[PDB]
Amino acid sequence: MCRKKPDTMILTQIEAKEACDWLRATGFPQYAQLYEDFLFPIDISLVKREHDFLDRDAIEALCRRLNTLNKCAVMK
């Protein structure tokens, strides 16, 4: 399957593995598990409402991984 750049094809897979390591190191090993289950396509406006305890900065940082996961979840 040679066609795309020999790094971007893996950048999309490290965007899942680094989300596992990031979500786990940050405080949320469950969000990684939810994507590693079957790539779950949630709305950030749902998890933002449930984690409204945290700052907008914590939600934007969490949203960086969750949006990346929720993105590959709608895009296979």
Side-chain angles (χ1 to χ4, degrees):
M1 60 183 168
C2 52
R3 228 191 167 195
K4 288 226 138 193
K5 200 163 181 164
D7 236 307
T8 190
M9 281 271 129
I10 297 142
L11 218 191
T12 269
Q13 289 197 291
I14 166 178
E15 272 211 290
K17 107 71 143 192
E18 88 170 58
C20 191
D21 193 40
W22 187 99
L23 295 162
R24 183 168 234 198
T26 290
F28 311 104
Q30 177 60 87
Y31 287 139
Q33 233 81 283
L34 270 150
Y35 176 95
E36 293 275 60
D37 194 279
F38 231 108
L39 320 93
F40 78 138
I42 91 212
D43 188 354
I44 296 298
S45 282
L46 122 70
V47 285
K48 177 213 282 270
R49 229 180 242 289
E50 287 289 278
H51 271 273
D52 180 74
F53 165 64
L54 310 173
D55 301 305
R56 66 217 169 193
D57 176 59
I59 240 299
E60 284 226 271
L62 171 59
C63 171
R64 193 157 178 174
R65 274 57 183 184
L66 279 183
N67 180 54
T68 273
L69 296 183
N70 302 332
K71 170 253 275 287
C72 289
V74 295
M75 303 211 303
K76 300 94 196 271

Coordinates of all heavy atoms in Angstrom, one line a residue:
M1 N 0.8 -1.2 0.0 CA 0.0 0.0 0.0 C 0.9 1.3 0.0 O 0.5 2.3 0.6 CB -1.1 0.0 1.1 CG -0.5 -0.1 2.6 SD -1.7 -0.3 3.9 CE -0.7 -0.7 5.3
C2 N 2.0 1.3 -0.7 CA 2.8 2.6 -0.9 C 2.0 3.6 -1.8 O 1.6 3.3 -2.9 CB 4.2 2.2 -1.5 SG 4.1 1.1 -2.9
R3 N 1.8 4.8 -1.3 CA 1.2 5.9 -2.0 C 1.4 7.3 -1.3 O 2.0 8.2 -1.8 CB -0.3 5.7 -2.4 CG -0.6 6.0 -3.8 CD -2.1 6.0 -4.1 NE -2.4 6.5 -5.4 CZ -3.6 7.0 -5.9 NH1 -4.7 6.8 -5.2 NH2 -3.6 7.6 -7.0
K4 N 0.9 7.3 -0.1 CA 1.0 8.4 0.9 C 2.4 8.5 1.5 O 3.2 7.5 1.4 CB -0.1 8.4 1.9 CG -1.5 8.7 1.3 CD -2.3 9.7 2.2 CE -3.0 10.8 1.3 NZ -3.5 11.9 2.0
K5 N 2.7 9.7 2.1 CA 4.0 9.9 2.7 C 4.3 8.9 3.8 O 3.4 8.6 4.6 CB 4.0 11.4 3.3 CG 5.4 11.9 3.5 CD 5.4 13.5 3.6 CE 6.8 14.0 3.9 NZ 6.9 15.5 3.6
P6 N 5.5 8.3 3.9 CA 5.9 7.3 4.9 C 6.1 7.8 6.3 O 7.1 7.5 7.0 CB 7.2 6.6 4.3 CG 7.8 7.8 3.5 CD 6.7 8.6 3.0
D7 N 5.1 8.6 6.8 CA 5.0 9.1 8.2 C 3.6 9.5 8.5 O 3.1 9.1 9.6 CB 5.9 10.4 8.3 CG 6.9 10.2 9.4 OD1 6.5 9.9 10.6 OD2 8.2 10.4 9.2
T8 N 2.8 10.2 7.6 CA 1.4 10.6 7.9 C 0.5 9.4 8.1 O -0.4 9.5 9.0 CB 0.9 11.5 6.8 OG1 -0.3 12.1 7.1 CG2 0.7 10.8 5.4
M9 N 0.7 8.3 7.4 CA 0.0 7.0 7.7 C 0.1 6.5 9.1 O -0.8 5.9 9.6 CB 0.5 6.0 6.7 CG -0.1 6.2 5.3 SD -1.6 5.3 5.0 CE -2.7 6.6 4.3
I10 N 1.3 6.8 9.7 CA 1.5 6.4 11.1 C 1.1 7.5 12.0 O 0.6 7.2 13.1 CB 3.0 6.0 11.3 CG1 3.4 4.8 10.5 CG2 3.4 5.8 12.8 CD1 4.8 4.8 9.8
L11 N 1.2 8.8 11.7 CA 0.8 10.0 12.5 C -0.6 9.8 13.0 O -0.9 10.0 14.1 CB 1.1 11.3 11.8 CG 1.5 12.5 12.6 CD1 1.5 13.8 11.8 CD2 0.7 12.7 13.9
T12 N -1.5 9.3 12.1 CA -2.9 9.0 12.4 C -3.1 7.8 13.4 O -4.0 7.8 14.3 CB -3.7 8.7 11.1 OG1 -4.3 9.9 10.7 CG2 -4.8 7.7 11.2
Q13 N -2.1 6.8 13.5 CA -2.1 5.8 14.5 C -1.4 6.2 15.8 O -1.9 5.9 16.8 CB -1.4 4.5 13.9 CG -2.2 3.8 12.8 CD -1.6 2.4 12.6 OE1 -0.6 2.2 12.1 NE2 -2.4 1.3 13.0
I14 N -0.3 6.9 15.8 CA 0.2 7.5 17.0 C -0.8 8.5 17.6 O -1.0 8.5 18.8 CB 1.7 8.1 16.9 CG1 2.0 9.1 18.1 CG2 1.9 8.9 15.6 CD1 3.4 9.7 18.2
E15 N -1.6 9.2 16.8 CA -2.8 10.0 17.3 C -3.8 9.2 18.1 O -4.5 9.8 19.0 CB -3.4 10.8 16.2 CG -2.8 12.2 16.0 CD -3.8 13.3 15.5 OE1 -4.3 13.2 14.4 OE2 -4.1 14.2 16.4
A16 N -3.8 7.9 18.0 CA -4.6 7.0 18.9 C -3.7 6.5 20.1 O -4.1 6.5 21.2 CB -5.1 5.8 18.1
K17 N -2.4 6.1 19.8 CA -1.5 5.6 20.9 C -1.1 6.7 21.9 O -1.1 6.4 23.1 CB -0.3 4.8 20.3 CG 1.1 5.4 20.2 CD 1.7 5.5 21.6 CE 3.2 5.2 21.6 NZ 3.8 5.0 23.0
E18 N -0.8 7.8 21.4 CA -0.5 9.0 22.2 C -1.7 9.5 22.9 O -1.6 10.0 24.0 CB 0.1 10.2 21.4 CG -0.8 11.2 20.7 CD -0.1 12.4 20.2 OE1 0.8 12.3 19.3 OE2 -0.5 13.5 20.6
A19 N -2.9 9.3 22.3 CA -4.2 9.6 23.1 C -4.3 8.6 24.2 O -4.6 9.1 25.3 CB -5.4 9.6 22.2
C20 N -4.0 7.3 24.1 CA -4.0 6.4 25.2 C -3.0 6.8 26.3 O -3.3 7.0 27.4 CB -3.7 5.0 24.7 SG -4.0 3.8 26.0
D21 N -1.7 7.1 25.9 CA -0.7 7.6 26.8 C -1.0 8.9 27.5 O -0.8 9.1 28.7 CB 0.7 7.5 26.1 CG 1.9 7.7 27.0 OD1 1.9 7.1 28.2 OD2 2.9 8.3 26.6
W22 N -1.5 9.9 26.7 CA -1.8 11.3 27.1 C -3.1 11.2 28.1 O -3.0 11.7 29.2 CB -2.1 12.2 25.9 CG -2.4 13.6 26.2 CD1 -1.5 14.6 26.1 CD2 -3.6 14.3 26.7 NE1 -2.0 15.8 26.4 CE2 -3.3 15.7 26.9 CE3 -4.9 13.9 27.0 CZ2 -4.2 16.6 27.4 CZ3 -5.8 14.8 27.6 CH2 -5.5 16.1 27.8
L23 N -4.2 10.6 27.7 CA -5.4 10.5 28.5 C -5.0 9.8 29.8 O -5.4 10.3 30.9 CB -6.5 9.8 27.7 CG -7.0 10.6 26.4 CD1 -7.8 9.7 25.5 CD2 -7.9 11.7 26.8
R24 N -4.3 8.7 29.8 CA -3.8 7.9 30.9 C -2.9 8.8 31.8 O -3.1 8.8 33.1 CB -3.1 6.7 30.5 CG -2.6 5.8 31.6 CD -2.2 4.4 31.1 NE -2.9 3.3 31.8 CZ -2.5 2.0 31.9 NH1 -1.5 1.6 31.2 NH2 -3.2 1.2 32.6
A25 N -1.9 9.5 31.3 CA -1.0 10.4 32.1 C -1.7 11.6 32.6 O -1.3 12.1 33.7 CB 0.2 10.7 31.2
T26 N -2.6 12.2 31.9 CA -3.4 13.4 32.3 C -4.4 13.1 33.4 O -4.4 13.8 34.4 CB -4.2 13.9 31.1 OG1 -3.2 14.5 30.2 CG2 -5.2 15.0 31.4
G27 N -5.2 12.0 33.3 CA -6.2 11.6 34.4 C -7.4 10.8 33.9 O -8.4 10.8 34.7
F28 N -7.5 10.3 32.7 CA -8.7 9.7 32.0 C -8.4 8.4 31.2 O -8.7 8.4 30.0 CB -9.2 10.8 31.1 CG -9.4 12.2 31.7 CD1 -8.6 13.2 31.4 CD2 -10.5 12.5 32.5 CE1 -8.7 14.5 31.9 CE2 -10.7 13.7 33.1 CZ -9.8 14.8 32.8
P29 N -7.9 7.4 31.8 CA -7.6 6.1 31.1 C -8.9 5.5 30.4 O -8.8 4.7 29.5 CB -6.9 5.2 32.1 CG -7.4 5.7 33.4 CD -7.6 7.2 33.2
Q30 N -10.1 5.8 30.9 CA -11.4 5.4 30.3 C -11.6 6.0 28.9 O -12.2 5.3 28.0 CB -12.5 5.9 31.2 CG -13.9 5.6 30.8 CD -14.2 4.1 30.5 OE1 -14.6 3.4 31.4 NE2 -14.1 3.6 29.3
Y31 N -11.3 7.2 28.6 CA -11.5 7.8 27.2 C -10.7 7.1 26.1 O -11.2 6.9 25.0 CB -11.2 9.3 27.2 CG -12.1 10.2 28.0 CD1 -11.6 11.3 28.7 CD2 -13.5 10.1 27.8 CE1 -12.4 12.2 29.4 CE2 -14.4 11.0 28.5 CZ -13.8 12.1 29.3 OH -14.7 13.0 29.9
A32 N -9.5 6.7 26.4 CA -8.7 5.9 25.6 C -9.4 4.5 25.3 O -9.5 4.1 24.2 CB -7.3 5.7 26.2
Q33 N -9.8 3.9 26.4 CA -10.6 2.6 26.4 C -11.8 2.7 25.5 O -12.1 1.8 24.7 CB -10.9 2.2 27.8 CG -10.4 0.7 28.1 CD -9.0 0.7 28.5 OE1 -8.1 0.8 27.6 NE2 -8.7 0.6 29.7
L34 N -12.6 3.8 25.5 CA -13.8 4.0 24.7 C -13.5 4.0 23.2 O -14.3 3.5 22.4 CB -14.5 5.3 25.2 CG -15.5 5.1 26.3 CD1 -15.6 6.3 27.2 CD2 -16.9 4.8 25.8
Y35 N -12.4 4.6 22.8 CA -11.9 4.6 21.4 C -11.3 3.2 21.0 O -11.6 2.7 20.0 CB -10.9 5.7 21.1 CG -10.4 5.7 19.7 CD1 -10.9 6.5 18.7 CD2 -9.2 5.0 19.5 CE1 -10.3 6.6 17.5 CE2 -8.5 5.1 18.2 CZ -9.1 6.0 17.2 OH -8.4 6.2 16.1
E36 N -10.4 2.7 21.9 CA -9.8 1.4 21.7 C -10.8 0.2 21.6 O -10.5 -0.9 21.1 CB -8.7 1.2 22.7 CG -7.5 2.1 22.6 CD -6.5 1.6 21.6 OE1 -6.8 1.4 20.4 OE2 -5.3 1.4 22.0
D37 N -12.1 0.4 22.1 CA -13.2 -0.5 22.0 C -13.7 -0.6 20.5 O -13.7 -1.7 20.0 CB -14.4 0.1 22.9 CG -15.5 -1.0 23.1 OD1 -16.3 -1.1 22.2 OD2 -15.5 -1.6 24.1
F38 N -14.1 0.5 19.9 CA -14.6 0.5 18.5 C -14.6 1.9 17.8 O -15.5 2.1 16.9 CB -16.0 -0.2 18.5 CG -16.1 -1.3 17.4 CD1 -16.1 -2.6 17.8 CD2 -16.1 -0.9 16.0 CE1 -16.1 -3.6 16.8 CE2 -16.1 -1.9 15.1 CZ -16.1 -3.3 15.4
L39 N -13.7 2.8 18.1 CA -13.7 4.2 17.7 C -15.0 4.9 17.9 O -15.8 5.0 17.0 CB -13.1 4.3 16.3 CG -11.9 3.5 15.9 CD1 -12.3 2.2 15.2 CD2 -11.0 4.2 14.9
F40 N -15.3 5.4 19.1 CA -16.6 6.0 19.5 C -16.7 7.5 19.1 O -15.9 8.3 19.4 CB -16.7 5.8 21.0 CG -16.0 6.7 22.0 CD1 -16.6 7.2 23.1 CD2 -14.6 7.1 21.8 CE1 -16.0 8.1 24.0 CE2 -13.9 7.9 22.7 CZ -14.6 8.4 23.8
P41 N -17.7 7.9 18.2 CA -17.9 9.2 17.7 C -18.8 10.1 18.6 O -19.9 10.3 18.3 CB -18.4 9.1 16.3 CG -19.3 7.8 16.4 CD -18.6 7.0 17.5
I42 N -18.3 10.5 19.8 CA -19.0 11.4 20.7 C -18.9 12.9 20.3 O -18.0 13.3 19.6 CB -18.7 11.2 22.2 CG1 -17.5 12.1 22.7 CG2 -18.5 9.7 22.5 CD1 -16.6 11.5 23.8
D43 N -19.8 13.7 20.8 CA -19.8 15.2 20.7 C -19.0 15.7 21.9 O -19.3 15.4 23.1 CB -21.2 15.7 20.7 CG -21.3 17.2 20.4 OD1 -20.2 17.9 20.3 OD2 -22.4 17.7 20.3
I44 N -17.9 16.6 21.7 CA -17.2 17.3 22.7 C -18.2 18.1 23.6 O -18.0 18.1 24.8 CB -16.1 18.1 22.2 CG1 -15.0 17.3 21.5 CG2 -15.5 19.1 23.2 CD1 -14.3 16.3 22.4
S45 N -19.3 18.7 23.0 CA -20.3 19.4 23.8 C -21.1 18.5 24.8 O -21.7 19.0 25.7 CB -21.3 20.1 22.9 OG -20.7 21.3 22.5
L46 N -21.0 17.1 24.7 CA -21.5 16.2 25.7 C -20.5 16.0 26.8 O -20.8 16.3 28.0 CB -22.0 14.9 25.0 CG -21.3 13.5 25.4 CD1 -21.7 13.0 26.8 CD2 -21.8 12.4 24.4
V47 N -19.2 15.6 26.5 CA -18.2 15.4 27.6 C -17.8 16.7 28.3 O -17.6 16.7 29.5 CB -17.0 14.7 27.1 CG1 -17.3 13.2 26.8 CG2 -16.4 15.3 25.7
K48 N -17.8 17.8 27.6 CA -17.6 19.2 28.2 C -18.7 19.5 29.3 O -18.3 20.0 30.3 CB -17.7 20.2 27.0 CG -17.6 21.7 27.5 CD -18.4 22.7 26.6 CE -17.7 23.0 25.3 NZ -16.9 24.2 25.4
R49 N -19.9 19.1 29.0 CA -21.0 19.3 29.9 C -20.9 18.5 31.2 O -21.2 18.9 32.3 CB -22.4 19.1 29.2 CG -23.4 20.3 29.5 CD -24.7 20.1 28.8 NE -25.0 21.1 27.8 CZ -25.3 22.4 28.0 NH1 -25.4 22.9 29.2 NH2 -25.6 23.2 27.0
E50 N -20.5 17.2 31.0 CA -20.3 16.3 32.1 C -19.0 16.6 32.9 O -19.0 16.3 34.2 CB -20.2 14.8 31.5 CG -21.6 14.3 31.1 CD -22.5 14.0 32.3 OE1 -22.3 12.9 32.9 OE2 -23.3 14.8 32.7
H51 N -18.0 17.1 32.3 CA -16.7 17.5 32.9 C -16.5 19.0 33.1 O -15.4 19.6 33.2 CB -15.5 16.8 32.2 CG -15.2 15.5 32.8 ND1 -14.4 15.2 33.9 CD2 -15.8 14.3 32.5 CE1 -14.4 13.9 34.2 NE2 -15.2 13.3 33.4
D52 N -17.7 19.7 33.2 CA -17.8 21.2 33.5 C -17.1 21.6 34.9 O -16.8 22.7 35.1 CB -19.3 21.6 33.5 CG -19.5 23.0 33.8 OD1 -19.2 23.9 32.9 OD2 -20.0 23.4 34.9
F53 N -16.8 20.6 35.7 CA -15.9 20.7 36.9 C -14.5 21.3 36.5 O -14.0 22.1 37.2 CB -15.8 19.3 37.6 CG -14.6 19.2 38.5 CD1 -14.6 20.0 39.7 CD2 -13.6 18.4 38.2 CE1 -13.5 20.0 40.5 CE2 -12.4 18.3 39.1 CZ -12.4 19.1 40.2
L54 N -14.0 20.8 35.4 CA -12.7 21.2 34.9 C -12.7 22.6 34.2 O -13.8 23.0 33.8 CB -12.1 20.1 33.9 CG -12.1 18.7 34.4 CD1 -11.8 17.8 33.2 CD2 -11.2 18.4 35.5
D55 N -11.6 23.2 34.0 CA -11.5 24.5 33.3 C -11.7 24.3 31.8 O -11.5 23.2 31.2 CB -10.1 25.1 33.5 CG -9.8 25.4 34.9 OD1 -10.6 26.1 35.6 OD2 -8.7 25.0 35.4
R56 N -12.1 25.3 31.0 CA -12.1 25.4 29.6 C -10.7 25.0 29.0 O -10.7 24.3 27.9 CB -12.5 26.8 29.1 CG -11.5 27.9 29.5 CD -12.3 29.2 29.9 NE -11.3 30.2 30.5 CZ -11.6 31.3 31.1 NH1 -12.9 31.7 31.2 NH2 -10.7 32.0 31.7
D57 N -9.6 25.3 29.6 CA -8.3 24.9 29.2 C -8.1 23.3 29.3 O -7.6 22.7 28.4 CB -7.2 25.6 30.1 CG -5.8 25.1 29.8 OD1 -5.3 25.2 28.6 OD2 -5.1 24.6 30.7
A58 N -8.5 22.7 30.4 CA -8.5 21.3 30.6 C -9.4 20.6 29.6 O -9.1 19.6 29.0 CB -9.0 21.0 32.0
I59 N -10.6 21.2 29.3 CA -11.5 20.7 28.3 C -10.9 20.9 26.9 O -11.1 20.0 26.1 CB -13.0 21.2 28.4 CG1 -13.9 20.0 28.6 CG2 -13.4 22.1 27.3 CD1 -14.0 19.0 27.4
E60 N -10.2 22.0 26.5 CA -9.6 22.1 25.2 C -8.4 21.2 25.0 O -8.3 20.6 23.9 CB -9.1 23.6 25.0 CG -10.3 24.5 24.7 CD -9.9 25.5 23.5 OE1 -9.3 26.6 23.7 OE2 -10.2 25.1 22.3
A61 N -7.7 20.9 26.1 CA -6.6 19.9 26.0 C -7.1 18.5 25.9 O -6.7 17.7 25.1 CB -5.8 20.1 27.3
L62 N -8.1 18.1 26.7 CA -8.9 16.8 26.6 C -9.6 16.7 25.2 O -9.4 15.7 24.6 CB -9.9 16.7 27.8 CG -10.9 15.6 27.7 CD1 -10.2 14.2 27.6 CD2 -11.8 15.6 28.9
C63 N -10.2 17.7 24.8 CA -10.8 17.9 23.4 C -9.8 17.7 22.4 O -10.1 17.0 21.4 CB -11.5 19.3 23.3 SG -12.0 19.6 21.6
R64 N -8.5 18.1 22.5 CA -7.5 17.8 21.5 C -7.4 16.3 21.2 O -7.3 15.9 20.0 CB -6.2 18.4 21.9 CG -5.2 18.4 20.7 CD -4.2 19.5 20.9 NE -3.2 19.6 19.8 CZ -2.3 20.5 19.6 NH1 -2.1 21.5 20.5 NH2 -1.4 20.4 18.6
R65 N -7.3 15.4 22.3 CA -7.3 14.0 22.1 C -8.7 13.4 21.8 O -8.8 12.7 20.8 CB -6.7 13.3 23.4 CG -5.2 13.3 23.3 CD -4.5 14.6 23.1 NE -3.0 14.5 23.0 CZ -2.2 15.6 22.9 NH1 -2.6 16.8 23.0 NH2 -1.0 15.4 22.6
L66 N -9.7 13.7 22.6 CA -11.1 13.3 22.3 C -11.6 13.7 20.9 O -12.0 12.8 20.2 CB -12.1 13.7 23.4 CG -12.0 12.8 24.6 CD1 -13.1 13.3 25.6 CD2 -12.4 11.4 24.3
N67 N -11.4 14.9 20.4 CA -11.7 15.3 19.0 C -10.9 14.4 18.0 O -11.5 13.9 17.1 CB -11.4 16.8 18.8 CG -11.8 17.2 17.4 OD1 -12.8 17.0 16.8 ND2 -10.8 17.8 16.7
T68 N -9.6 14.2 18.2 CA -8.8 13.3 17.4 C -9.4 11.9 17.3 O -9.5 11.3 16.2 CB -7.4 13.4 17.9 OG1 -6.7 14.5 17.2 CG2 -6.5 12.1 17.6
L69 N -9.8 11.4 18.5 CA -10.4 10.0 18.6 C -11.8 10.0 17.9 O -12.1 9.2 17.0 CB -10.4 9.6 20.1 CG -9.0 9.4 20.7 CD1 -9.2 8.9 22.1 CD2 -8.1 8.5 19.9
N70 N -12.7 11.0 18.3 CA -14.1 11.2 17.8 C -14.1 11.5 16.2 O -15.0 11.1 15.5 CB -14.7 12.4 18.5 CG -14.9 12.2 20.0 OD1 -14.9 11.1 20.5 ND2 -14.9 13.3 20.7
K71 N -13.0 12.0 15.7 CA -12.7 12.3 14.3 C -12.4 11.0 13.5 O -13.2 10.6 12.6 CB -11.6 13.3 14.2 CG -11.0 13.5 12.7 CD -9.6 12.9 12.6 CE -8.5 13.9 13.0 NZ -8.3 15.0 12.1
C72 N -11.4 10.2 14.0 CA -11.2 8.9 13.4 C -12.4 7.9 13.6 O -12.6 7.0 12.8 CB -9.9 8.3 13.9 SG -8.5 9.2 13.2
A73 N -13.2 8.1 14.7 CA -14.4 7.4 14.9 C -15.5 7.7 13.9 O -16.2 6.7 13.5 CB -14.9 7.8 16.3
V74 N -15.7 8.9 13.4 CA -16.6 9.1 12.2 C -15.9 8.8 10.9 O -16.6 8.5 9.9 CB -17.2 10.6 12.2 CG1 -18.2 10.8 13.4 CG2 -16.2 11.7 12.2
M75 N -14.6 8.8 10.8 CA -13.8 8.6 9.5 C -13.1 7.3 9.4 O -12.1 7.2 8.7 CB -12.9 9.8 9.3 CG -13.6 11.2 9.3 SD -12.8 12.4 8.2 CE -11.1 12.5 8.9
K76 N -13.6 6.2 10.1 CA -13.1 4.8 10.1 C -11.8 4.6 10.8 O -11.7 3.5 11.4 CB -13.1 4.2 8.7 CG -14.5 4.1 8.0 CD -14.7 5.3 7.0 CE -16.2 5.4 6.7 NZ -16.6 4.7 5.5

